[PDB]
Amino acid sequence: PRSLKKGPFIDLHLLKKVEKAVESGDKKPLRTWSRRSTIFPNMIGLTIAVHNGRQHVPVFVTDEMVGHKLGEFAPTRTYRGHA
Amino acid sequence: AKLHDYYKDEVVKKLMTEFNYNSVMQVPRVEKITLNMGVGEAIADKKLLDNAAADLAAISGQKPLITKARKSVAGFKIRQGYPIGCKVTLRGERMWEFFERLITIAVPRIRDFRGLSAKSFDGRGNYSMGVREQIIFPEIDYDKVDRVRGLDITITTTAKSDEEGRALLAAFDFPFR
Amino acid sequence: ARIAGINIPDHKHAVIALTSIYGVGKTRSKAILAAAGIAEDVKISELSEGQIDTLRDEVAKFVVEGDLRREISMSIKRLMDLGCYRGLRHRRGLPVRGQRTKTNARTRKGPRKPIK
Amino acid sequence: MKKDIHPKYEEITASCSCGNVMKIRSTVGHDLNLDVCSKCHPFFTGKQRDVATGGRVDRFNKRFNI
RNA sequence: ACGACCAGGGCUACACACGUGCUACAAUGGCGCAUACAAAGAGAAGCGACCUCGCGAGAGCAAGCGGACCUCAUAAAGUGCGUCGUAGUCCGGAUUGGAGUCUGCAACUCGACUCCAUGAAGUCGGAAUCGCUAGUAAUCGUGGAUCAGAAUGCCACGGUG
RNA sequence: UCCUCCUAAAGAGUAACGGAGGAGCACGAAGGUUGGCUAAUCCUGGUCGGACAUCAGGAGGUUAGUGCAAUGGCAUAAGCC
Ligand SMILES: [Mg+2]
Ligand SMILES: [Mg+2]
Ligand SMILES: [Mg+2]
Ligand SMILES: [Mg+2]
Ligand SMILES: [Mg+2]
Ligand SMILES: [Mg+2]
Ligand SMILES: [Mg+2]
Ligand SMILES: [Mg+2]
Ligand SMILES: [Mg+2]
Ligand SMILES: [Mg+2]
Ligand SMILES: [Mg+2]
Ligand SMILES: [Mg+2]
Ligand SMILES: [Mg+2]
Ligand SMILES: [Mg+2]
Ligand SMILES: [Mg+2]
Ligand SMILES: [Mg+2]
Ligand SMILES: [Zn+2]
């Protein structure tokens, strides 16, 4: 993982979109290609449509979803089985 | 009979208060404790039954009654009359002294003990629990034994309801939860 | 010879029979015996019961069998309930850490499953 | 009770690490030294402490400052 | 547009089959402490002492070096003493959880390493099959290229033999 | 050849190449006596333990049992120790 001295990581355009949806108080799904951004505690309660390579799957943000990144909730390989 | 004296002096006064019974004979009381080991594997060998009865004879100092099959079932490959388990009925002072050694020694010797259930009172006050492993009693030597048995305890009391027995064991600080 | 719920073999040494505890290893067993002042070359035999009580207090300083198994199951079911990639790997039975599943995933996948 | 078929059931003393000296009737014969008793078992404090969920937001804010 | 630009994903998937390798199943050994003997290489957007802090990977300050000068860099196997005493073990280390470091805009998919805990299979391998004739096989470590980072592969080096 | 039920018409008996089933034994205790006991099934709770072993309680009240076919009996048990 990343060093603590660097802190977390998040895209600036994402942190501005979070700050906008916070101040506006709108619950629109934020579509986002930032699969590498760590979730912040101010992101709790938002639908964020994480890209997977092909489309945007919506992720409601939970308390437990704080210390992770957005890509963990957007699986990129679809596998059902061989038979 | 130490807990029997503690029953007779403080539990009856407590329950008469917390239920507002008309008579003192209306209070619950414990009647018997039954110690079963269902040994369905003794059809393989008698020695497993014969040694499981030896361990439980050490727990409660009575010779166990070897129980047999009431009828025959084929899913278990048993016939009517095979010795299939062992039981011990405990009454009186030997009941109270086992119940003291139980709630004082053996329940703390449970691995990962985290409480009992209050949902095991068979709708009519009679409590039933089952232990996974006989080594929680200190009567059994750990090197000397070879096979992990298990038994089940059935406390039969005179409480009509389920809560009057729950309050009775809680008056004996029985670790429900 | 009975620490933290379970029994402990007497013929082995101190650090090893302590390492029989689910939650300690040779490191933490050295930290236990160093905090109890007990030499490592002694057995669980020829120990004072006061030394074993000091040992029980030192083991009680850490997280062990029932607590540790509860915490491990809580972390796994936290990933299960989140539905992250690690949760999906934990419930598909597949390796979590990014290993290969084309070949050599036999620890998580068990023995071979023949094509029928 | 019957006479011979039963094992010996004799009053002995069982002392514990919390110093809970307790005399019980048992089939052990020798005296007993315990590890935990019902007085000193962590059923009333330790199992309550041993859940220990902890917070994820608090972990996040703990790891740094803005 | 079968051309060009960008983000994200993929080339790392997984009922399975094969090839080439690594580590093992231990006592001709795992352990701990002490200690002896190498060669050949690389280094400036680099190698990075000493000292301090950290259990640690590492961090800070910071000399010296375009290098028979300085650095990578203490060779390990070995030997001496004690230890385990045949067990799925003080063998084996997979797997998984938690805490971290570093590189790099950025380690979710998808990095390496460290610490604590965890401790699978495996007790010498069916039919079958491979390499090797002497400083060889076997075994033991070392270095380099590629490379921000990322080898059990490759290319080289000496030790025992 | 023998047993049981129906046909068989409320005493007995009563036929058909009429309708349905069994027997050609067993037991030295599965007999005698004294003493005692009372089922099937289901519900709940409960270690391994599972639809179903054993254990405790409750409903039920013979729907069970009778060495074997059926019928008639059987709690004073003819049933079970
Ligand atoms: Mg351990
Ligand atoms: Mg791209
Ligand atoms: Mg490829
Ligand atoms: Mg090892
Ligand atoms: Mg050596
Ligand atoms: Mg040694
Ligand atoms: Mg095996
Ligand atoms: Mg072996
Ligand atoms: Mg590199
Ligand atoms: Mg290089
Ligand atoms: Mg060589
Ligand atoms: Mg007539
Ligand atoms: Mg007539
Ligand atoms: Mg008869
Ligand atoms: Mg009679
Ligand atoms: Mg049941
Ligand atoms: Zn105590």
Give a written overview of the molecule:
- Chain C: This is Small ribosomal subunit protein uS13.
- Chain C: Residues 93-116 are annotated as: Disordered.
- Chain C: Keywords: Metal-binding, Ribonucleoprotein, Ribosomal protein, RNA-binding, rRNA-binding, tRNA-binding.
- Chain C: Mg(2+) binds at residues 19, 21, 24.
- This is part of a larger assembly, with chains A (83 residues), B (177 residues), C (116 residues) and D (66 residues).
- Chain A has 83 residues and is of the alpha+beta class.
- Chain A is 16% helix and 16% strand.
- Chain A is globular and about 50 Å long.
- Chain C is mainly alpha-helical.
- Chain C has a two-stranded antiparallel ribbon with strand order 1-2.
- Chain D is of the alpha+beta class.
- Chain D has 2 helices and 3 strands; from the N terminus they run βββαα.
- A 3-stranded mixed sheet of chain D has the order 2-1-3, with no helix packed on it.
- At the B-D interface, α2 and α3 of B face β2 of D.
- Zinc ion (ZN) binds at residues 16-18, 20, 36-37, 39-40 of chain D.
- The structure holds 2 RNA strands.
Give keywords.
part of a larger assembly; 4 chains; A: 83 residues; alpha+beta; three-stranded mixed β-sheet; 1 helix; 16% helix; C: 116 residues; mainly alpha; two-stranded antiparallel ribbon; 6 helices; 50% helix; binds magnesium ion; binds zinc ion; RNA-binding
